[PDB]
DNA sequence: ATGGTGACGCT
DNA sequence: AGCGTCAC
């Protein structure tokens, strides 16, 4: 039977990402609790990215930053940059391209976040175990990676137990069969180090990462031993792993399905899923849930690393919250133009970069009142990369909505806007 | 009043 | 197409 160990993926993310790309750029944010917030007005602002330091005092996103400054008055901010009267995320996107440049080097990666990667080293290592002819595989090769589950069996420092247990690991391998999936994990694990080497030295910022079998495993691995650490998870550590992991913590398990999961089978931990037939699980969450369910409980998953290091999307939002919320046609007009304006800087460069052109412009808006991320989504063509001409387009496809008799104002008035640039061609 | 991103499934 | 879920 299938034992979901034919590939070598991991997943590298970038730690306290915008934190570290605002430490490099000043030296005196470095090794200090710090944080990045967004828009200094209301409550001091929102924070969105927390440095270790300051997590040890309770700081986390979601949290304003005023608020943040109780728990720790010497947090240092930094603030994101605005433009057009918006956060404007152009210097995370900017280094972001960075590391992801850098991760293609070595495999084909996929693209996760602005932060993280998927990256399938199975050809990588196939490679590497042949021009490794014999030869034993030292510690000194992985002098940051943790063995998920060891040390076991018959120190007091954490260093001392990451070795311990890679010792352990080690002295194990069956460095004499190839087609070990453990070795290949292993070597695995040695090229990613390699991998954050060359990031760190070329980048200056710091990641961990995740080597396992597949996409689920290689991020939840990812995240035992962050920052700066990479973790192996085995196929062999998955069964006491998921003995008391609870389901929220897998990915795409975090929300409502996770939830339903959780009450209608009357469990809590990933590993009571096993004592569920296919079948069963298929008919309370659905074919395809519930195949990944059965599939996923016991280590095994089949998404594969998909070749794409762009984003299929080029998108621009603002909210307008509570008493802001835009009540007239001029104020719906310049903001969807500041929207637009930004876009279509970011559509030239995107265009000059990557030899592609957007073809469709989505349009989305919220009204007051209602209570979803989005009321109301219009696609129409976009022909070209004009500000005005885009920002005209939207106002056509969504002028529909102004209830309002009196059409200088605007009802009801609107508390979101969105522009997205979709479905590109080869340019 | 976290806000501003982005991928993908469903019908 | 337009809506919803899930994630960083
Ligand atoms: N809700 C969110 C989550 C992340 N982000 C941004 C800021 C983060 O630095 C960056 C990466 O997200 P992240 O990986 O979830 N967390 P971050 O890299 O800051 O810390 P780690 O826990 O990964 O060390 O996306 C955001 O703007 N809004
Ligand atoms: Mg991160
Ligand atoms: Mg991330």
Same mark, same amino acid.
């Given at each position: 039977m299938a034992t979901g160990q034919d590939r070598v993926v991991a997943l590298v993310d970038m730690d306290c990402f915008f934190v570290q790309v605002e430490q490099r750029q000043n030296?005196?944010?470095?090794?200090?609790?710090?944080?990045?917030?967004?828009?200094?007005?209301?409550?001091?602002?929102?924070?969105?990215?927390?440095?270790?330091?300051? $997590?040890?005092?309770g700081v986390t996103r979601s949290m304003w930053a005023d608020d943040a400054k109780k728990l720790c008055p010497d947090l240092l901010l930094a603030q994101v940059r605005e433009s057009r009267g918006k956060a404007n995320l152009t210097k995370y996107r900017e280094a972001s391209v960075e590391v992801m440049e850098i991760m293609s080097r070595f495999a084909v990666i996929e693209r996760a976040s602005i932060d993280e990667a998927?990256?399938?080293?199975?050809?990588?290592?196939?490679?590497?175990?042949?021009?490794?002819?014999?030869?034993?595989?030292?510690?000194?090769?992985?002098?940051?990676?943790?063995?998920e589950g060891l040390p076991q069996g018959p120190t007091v420092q954490k260093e001392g137990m990451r070795k311990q247990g890679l010792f352990q690991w080690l002295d194990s391998l069956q460095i004499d069969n190839l087609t070990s999936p453990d070795l290949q994990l292993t070597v695995g694990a040695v090229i990613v180090e390699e991998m954050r080497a060359a990031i760190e030295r070329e980048t200056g910022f710091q990641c961990s990462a995740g080597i396992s079998h597949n996409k689920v495993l290689a991020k939840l691995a990812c995240g035992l031993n962050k920052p700066n650490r990479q973790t192996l998870v085995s196929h062999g550590?998955?069964?006491?792993?998921?003995?008391?992991?609870? %389901?929220?913590?897998?990915?795409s398990l975090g929300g409502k399905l996770g939830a339903?999961?959780?009450?209608?089978?009357?469990?809590?931990?990933?590993?009571?899923?096993?004592?569920?037939?296919?079948?069963?699980?298929?008919?309370?969450?659905?074919?395809?849930?519930?195949?990944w369910l059965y599939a996923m409980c016991r280590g095994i998953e089949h998404d594969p690393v998909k070749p794409r290091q762009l984003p299929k999307t080029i998108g621009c939002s603002k909210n307008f919250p509570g008493k802001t919320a835009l009540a007239t046609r001029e104020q719906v007009q310049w903001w969807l133009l500041q929207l637009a304006?930004?876009?279509?800087?970011?559509?030239?460069?995107?265009?000059?970069?990557?030899?592609?052109?957007?073809?469709?412009?989505?349009?989305?808006? $919220?009204?007051?009142?209602?209570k979803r991320l989005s009321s109301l989504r219009r696609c129409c063509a976009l022909t070209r990369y004009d500000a005005h001409?885009?920002?005209?387009?939207?106002?056509?496809?969504?002028?529909?909505?102004?209830?309002?008799? %009196?059409?200088?104002?605007?009802?009801?008035p609107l508390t979101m806007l969105f522009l997205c640039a979709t479905k590109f061609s080869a340019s």
């Open positions: 030296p005196h944010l470095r090794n200090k609790p710090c944080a990045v917030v967004q828009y200094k007005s209301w409550k001091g602002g929102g924070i969105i990215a927390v440095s270790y330091e300051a $997590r040890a005092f998927y990256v399938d080293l199975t050809s990588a290592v196939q490679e590497r175990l042949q021009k490794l002819q014999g030869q034993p595989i030292s510690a000194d090769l992985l002098p940051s990676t943790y063995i550590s998955v069964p006491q792993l998921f003995s008391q992991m609870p %389901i929220r913590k897998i990915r339903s999961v959780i009450e209608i089978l009357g469990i809590e931990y990933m590993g009571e899923l096993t004592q569920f037939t296919e079948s069963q699980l298929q008919s309370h969450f659905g074919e395809k849930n519930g195949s304006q930004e876009l279509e800087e970011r559509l030239t460069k995107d265009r000059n970069d990557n030899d592609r052109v957007a073809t469709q412009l989505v349009v989305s808006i $919220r009204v007051q009142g209602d001409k885009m920002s005209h387009d939207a106002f056509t496809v969504i002028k529909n909505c102004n209830t309002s008799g %009196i059409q200088t104002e605007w009802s009801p």
